[PDB]
C-alpha cells in the first residue's frame with residue numbers, strides 16, 4: 001500500500017540534481033520511477049528541490065485546482081523542475097520522452113493529516 005504522499009514523491013520528487021541532466025533524463029527517469037510500466041504516462045514533472053521545500057508549498061498560495069477543487073497551492077518562489085512529454089515516435093513499451101528544464105512556480109494539490117502534496121497540478 002503506497003500512500004498518496006509516497007506516490008507523489010515517486011512520481012514527482014528528484015532532489016538529487018539541480019536541473020535536467022541530459023536529453024536522456026526523462027527516458028531514464030520515467031522508466032525507473034515506474035511511470036512507463038502499464039503504459040506511457042503522457043506528461044510528468046519532476047521537482048529538483050528538497051522535500052521540505054516542496055511540502056511547504058501546502059501552506060503557500062491557495063489557488064483553484066484544474067479539476068475545480070480548492071486544495072491547490074502555488075509556490076511563492078520559482079523552483080527547478082523538469083517536464084517530461086511523450087514523443088510521437090514513442091510506442092509503449094518503448095516510451096520515449098522530450099526533456100525540458102525550467103524554473104517555474106509549481107502548483108500541487110494537498111491532502112491529509114499531515115497536509116502534504118498528493119498531486120502535481122501545474123507549473124506557471
Ligand SMILES: Nc1ncnc2c1ncn2[C@@H]1O[C@H](COP(=O)(O)OP(=O)(O)OP(=O)(O)OP(=O)(O)OP(=O)(O)O)[C@@H](O)[C@H]1O
Nearest residue numbers: 011012041065067069070071072109110111118119120121
Ligand atoms: N485537487 C486534487 N486533489 C487531489 N487529487 C487530485 C486533485 N486533482 C486531481 N487529482 C488526482 O490526479 C489524478 C488526475 O489525473 P491527471 O493529472 O489528469 O493525470 P493521470 O491521467 O496521469 O492519472 P494518474 O496517472 O492517476 O496521474 P496521477 O494521479 O497518478 O499523478 P498526479 O496526480 O501527480 O498527476 C487523479 O488521481 C485525481 O484524483
